[PDB]
Scaffold this active site. Structure first.
Site, PDB file in Angstrom:
ATOM      1  N   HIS A  41       0.863  -1.098   0.033  1.00  0.00           N
ATOM      2  CA  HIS A  41       0.182  -0.032  -0.110  1.00  0.00           C
ATOM      3  C   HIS A  41       0.824   1.282  -0.078  1.00  0.00           C
ATOM      4  O   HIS A  41       0.269   2.374  -0.128  1.00  0.00           O
ATOM      5  CB  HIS A  41      -0.854  -0.160   1.127  1.00  0.00           C
ATOM      6  CG  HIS A  41      -0.444   0.272   2.426  1.00  0.00           C
ATOM      7  ND1 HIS A  41       0.381   1.329   2.931  1.00  0.00           N
ATOM      8  CD2 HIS A  41      -0.656  -0.703   3.605  1.00  0.00           C
ATOM      9  CE1 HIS A  41       0.511   1.052   4.211  1.00  0.00           C
ATOM     10  NE2 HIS A  41       0.115  -0.043   4.646  1.00  0.00           N
ATOM     11  N   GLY A 143       3.425   6.382  10.458  1.00  0.00           N
ATOM     12  CA  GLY A 143       4.774   5.813   9.870  1.00  0.00           C
ATOM     13  C   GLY A 143       5.430   4.967  10.274  1.00  0.00           C
ATOM     14  O   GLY A 143       6.719   4.349   9.747  1.00  0.00           O
ATOM     15  N   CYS A 145       4.449   1.575   9.538  1.00  0.00           N
ATOM     16  CA  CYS A 145       4.066   0.732   8.446  1.00  0.00           C
ATOM     17  C   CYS A 145       5.499   0.048   7.912  1.00  0.00           C
ATOM     18  O   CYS A 145       6.423   0.659   7.857  1.00  0.00           O
ATOM     19  CB  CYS A 145       3.215   0.922   7.127  1.00  0.00           C
ATOM     20  SG  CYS A 145       1.558   1.194   7.864  1.00  0.00           S
TER      21      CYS A 145
HETATM   22  C1  Y3N Z   1      -6.718   7.148   5.090  1.00  0.00           C
HETATM   23  C2  Y3N Z   1      -6.122   5.560   5.100  1.00  0.00           C
HETATM   24  O1  Y3N Z   1      -6.198   5.335   3.741  1.00  0.00           O
HETATM   25  N1  Y3N Z   1      -5.960   4.533   6.065  1.00  0.00           N
HETATM   26  C3  Y3N Z   1      -5.682   3.309   5.695  1.00  0.00           C
HETATM   27  C4  Y3N Z   1      -6.454   2.036   5.684  1.00  0.00           C
HETATM   28  C5  Y3N Z   1      -6.225   1.019   5.371  1.00  0.00           C
HETATM   29  C6  Y3N Z   1      -4.687   0.457   5.222  1.00  0.00           C
HETATM   30  C7  Y3N Z   1      -4.364  -0.949   4.748  1.00  0.00           C
HETATM   31  N2  Y3N Z   1      -3.874  -2.049   4.827  1.00  0.00           N
HETATM   32  C8  Y3N Z   1      -3.779   1.549   5.233  1.00  0.00           C
HETATM   33  C9  Y3N Z   1      -4.121   2.966   5.562  1.00  0.00           C
HETATM   34  C10 Y3N Z   1      -3.181   3.889   5.343  1.00  0.00           C
HETATM   35  F1  Y3N Z   1      -3.667   4.845   4.620  1.00  0.00           F
HETATM   36  F2  Y3N Z   1      -3.109   4.383   6.582  1.00  0.00           F
HETATM   37  F3  Y3N Z   1      -1.741   3.341   5.047  1.00  0.00           F
END
Ligand code: Y3N
Ligand code: CL
Ligand code: CL
Ligand code: NA
Ligand code: NA
Lengths: 306, 306
Positions: A41, A143, A145
């Protein structure tokens, strides 16, 4: 003496953490041999995240769209591809600090160490359990992830978790290092929730053995029980079923302390039915379930990782 | 979100741990630049436990009586000296892995990470606090002496503890890296006992602020208290006095959450009076006192939930 929630020494993993930037997003990557692993992502905008087509988003990216920093030196990305929910960035340089390692997928109830990182910089290390509902009760800010979870078994690091997202209740969801989610979650901004959780029975028993080993004995009693009888009680109190394999795994602790597992199960039954009556066990007023039998044995024996 | 007992990543300290052997005794040493630091009681024999004269024991030793092993490599000892209760062995190799570091003596209430070690190799990492009675509640087995406690600010390791001994209640005592013990303890096996321990009040308040930041307010109340009335109540529960220093220190967390420090004191007073009535705060059924104000600010978001 003493019993503490203990993480593995994190040095071997620290030497693998890098910063990965794609567009406006920065998060962490794991640099092993000549590949950097990170959540797929990383390539999404917030709009993309609402309903991503990852292959389609990826084809527009060039290697040079992935900014990878190891410490203060840039890494040259020379290839990119996905495996399930992880992005694999091939780089031109093998990580000279790559440890002996394996990718393993862990079972609910198993524990591991999390090295929380921000901008490729390790910031803290703590011990987690994979919950029965496949979340982990972590501590992660924006941050984080791509932070990873791991065990060390000899000199071999077994990587088992990559951090991907936080659920609305504040617990966390991620994948193994082959990009397969733990639990019924998807890497998309859509309504998702942790399922009802349960308590890891075999781990509570392990911790009770830890307590006895450390001199905390007030909960011991003269009674024993059977598996069927105990598992009725477990089910009523949202505890996981205790199986015969669990009993076998606890065998060593039963022999060392003189408390058979079903003997200990009778202690646990009484604790569930009556509470703790103002007392504590290893300094806790709650029954602790994030120590495995192996954790208790390791900490109560001094096993090291040079 | 989330809140965990979190240790510093241990790799910078791992790269400094060595094994120090003297006669039949083996324990851990800390290798920084060309000096290995370890507990001076490594030179004690079985007769020397109660009234060792360390000056007399040490003058009888030659450099080659000390065996220092770093991984598989013997280091050559080219000098030795005593500083208070630590031995400083000068060796013929500077540790190429020496981090930026300093030695700092900490005050009661301060937290640090411990890298438990055995035979010069790290076993696990956990978080500790210096208790008001100058002990720590660690997890240490025979052979753990010379294990160290530390914090990491930016990239600089502040060493604040070296492990020397376990007291009869199963708590632990040690020195700073200048070899001065914390508290009234001595490196002799003469009977000595920790003072009655108390709860670190400023840390409990910090942790209540953590709970608010992560979105929990159930324990607040409509009341306030004077500082002196708070202390009159809290010391009836074996809580440490809260000083104006402590109140000042809590200013930032008070501003972030909008809850005045003395209003949080009122919440604490009620919690001591009432218990938690089957509820939990940040996952605990007891009030937690091994998170400092600094720890809370470092781990929690800068944005409070609601
Ligand atoms: C605002 C948004 O998009 N939230 C979100 C939701 C799910 C996942 C996954 N897997 C990642 C995020 C992110 F953006 F924080 F990386
Ligand atoms: Cl301090
Ligand atoms: Cl608790
Ligand atoms: Na029993
Ligand atoms: Na070593």
């Amino acid at each position: 003496s003493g019993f503490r929630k203990m993480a593995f020494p994190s040095g071997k993993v620290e030497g693998c953490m890098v910063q990965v930037t794609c567009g406006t997003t920065t998060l962490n990557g794991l640099w092993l041999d000549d590949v950097v692993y990170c959540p797929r992502h990383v390539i999404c905008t917030s709009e993309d995240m609402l309903n991503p087509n990852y292959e389609d988003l990826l084809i527009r990216k060039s290697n040079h769209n992935f900014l990878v920093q190891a410490g203060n030196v840039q890494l040259r990305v020379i290839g990119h591809s996905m495996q399930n929910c992880v992005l694999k960035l091939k780089v031109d340089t093998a990580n000279p600090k790559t440890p002996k390692y394996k990718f393993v997928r862990i079972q609910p109830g198993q524990t591991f160490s999390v090295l929380a990182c921000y901008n490729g910089s390790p910031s803290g290390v703590y011990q987690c359990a994979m919950r029965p509902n496949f979340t982990i009760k972590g501590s992660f800010l924006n941050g984080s992830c791509g932070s990873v979870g791991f065990n060390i078994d000899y000199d071999c690091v077994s990587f088992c978790y990559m951090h991907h997202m936080e659920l609305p209740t504040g617990v966390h969801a991620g994948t193994d290092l082959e990009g397969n989610f733990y639990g019924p979650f998807v890497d998309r901004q859509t309504a998702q929730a942790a399922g009802t959780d349960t308590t890891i029975t075999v781990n509570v028993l392990a911790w009770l053995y830890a307590a006895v080993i450390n001199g905390d004995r007030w909960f011991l009693n003269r009674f024993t029980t059977t598996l069927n009888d105990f598992n009725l009680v477990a089910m009523k109190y949202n505890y996981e079923p205790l199986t015969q394999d669990h009993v076998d795994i606890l065998g060593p602790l039963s022999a060392q302390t003189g408390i058979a597992v079903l003997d200990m199960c009778a202690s646990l039954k009484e604790l569930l039915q009556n509470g703790m009556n103002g007392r504590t066990i290893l300094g806790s007023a709650l029954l602790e379930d994030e120590f495995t039998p192996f954790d208790v044995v390791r900490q109560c024996s001094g096993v090291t990782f040079q």
